[PDB]
Amino acid sequence: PRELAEAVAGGRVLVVGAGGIGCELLKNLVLTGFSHIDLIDLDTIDVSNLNRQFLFQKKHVGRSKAQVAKESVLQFYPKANIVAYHDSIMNPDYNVEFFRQFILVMNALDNRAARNHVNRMCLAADVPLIESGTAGYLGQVTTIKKGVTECYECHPKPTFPGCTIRNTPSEPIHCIVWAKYLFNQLFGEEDADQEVSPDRADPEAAWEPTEAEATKEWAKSTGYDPVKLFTKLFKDDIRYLLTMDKLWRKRKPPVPLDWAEVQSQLGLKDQQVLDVKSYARLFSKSIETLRVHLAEKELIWDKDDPSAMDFVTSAANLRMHIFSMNMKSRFDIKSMAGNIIPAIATTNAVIAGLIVLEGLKILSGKIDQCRTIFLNKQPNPRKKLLVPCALDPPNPNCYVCASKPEVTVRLNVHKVTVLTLQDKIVKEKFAMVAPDVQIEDGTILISSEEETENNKKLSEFGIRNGSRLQADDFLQDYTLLINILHSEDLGKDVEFEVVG
């Protein structure tokens, strides 16, 4: 209809992500008559993308997803006006004024952090946002509109103890996580929460109830010698672990491995489980490669780097062996370590089609007829495979979209650094990208421009059970007041808590 067609040919829309949803959605928007589109994605094309990201062919592997998506679309519709950004939406160039360009934003993302950021940008710019997601056979779409609907963060959204990872693993995943931690300890950012050595202070170990109540350096000094690492990790450490007699009263003791001893012992290739010797060899081989790579370019673990992936596979399977668990195929370990979401073309195609139908109702001034739509695998009792639900109103208590939002955080102000506040709390937990924290007292604490570096316990700034912080993200045009409670009874592994 005339009014709607004019809106669609007229205005400009933004698609955030050029993957499974994004490629389908780009196509549907162009064929529906959307004459001006911006598309952003930070990534390059991978061969695993090609079962469902249909604008990309094998010859395009390694090029920008966004740029190729545009080129492919122009081949069937040369008159399309598409701007492609090979970039992250989290870039501060994409500020409130950037978002204000658009009559409609559509998410095509694969993680919550970026979705949180986009939510804030769309609230700031007062532009409607269609949010969506998929995984396997399932998925959903919804509409977010400032002052009309819940925002993406109005509802709470859906973790291994250190001691189960370091001392008492009982599932393959514990071993997989251990190997990821080990990779970061050896080659990556050394994080204290990713310690791999046995834990000398574990409640289950302690004999009296009074105490129960209460790595890179070394590998550098060996030249990253595989055999020395193998012995320290698979022999020396396990024997040390076997020290902690309490642990092993109940459960099967681990059995230490010796390098020389081990050395003198269908579906897809990757679905085969190899023997101990082979994984020990893989471990050695992978280290020698990684050490070489760590000289050209700390490394970041990536499931798609063969060496990084082989390292994690072998390390986790040897640890599994040590604790008397069956070892797992590289294929299985790739799923678990990489958190791979199984994905196909049809689910993304359905979701993308719904996105545009929701978009049309918005731009048609018919938001009352917008819905949350769930895609089921099987019909509900009313025979519904796609299940529409009316939109809910903003949550008055939302920590994001409410008037002057405030939260409360319980931590130990004497043991928690100002870096843990910037990273574990304001950046990660509350999803700010460019944050600015300052104490509520007539005292700049964190700065957007990197200044500061503090990075000191909290109590050394005039911060105690009752202090209040004013966290800004000027990019997100978002302010959050954090009230501090103090406590020392948090837990061996709980370093802070958002009070509910």
Partner: protein, 62 residues
């Protein structure tokens, strides 16, 4: 009442509750009865519940 919660993956549970709902649903799920969202303070009586509750998770892939 005996009620059935059914999740997307066809996971069928037989609950058993009294007609006077926060305890039934026991925060990564949303709960529906024949179209309508289930509040914490909803009761079976209030909703005309004899039946089946459907549960939906938000997916985060794309």
């Amino acid at each position: 009442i005996k009620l059935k919660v059914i999740g997307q993956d066809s996971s069928e549970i037989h609950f058993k509750v009294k007609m006077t709902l926060k305890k039934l649903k026991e925060n990564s799920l949303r709960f529906l009865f024949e179209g309508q969202r289930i509040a914490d303070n909803h009761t079976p009586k209030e909703l005309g519940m004899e039946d089946v509750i459907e549960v939906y998770q938000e997916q985060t892939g794309g």
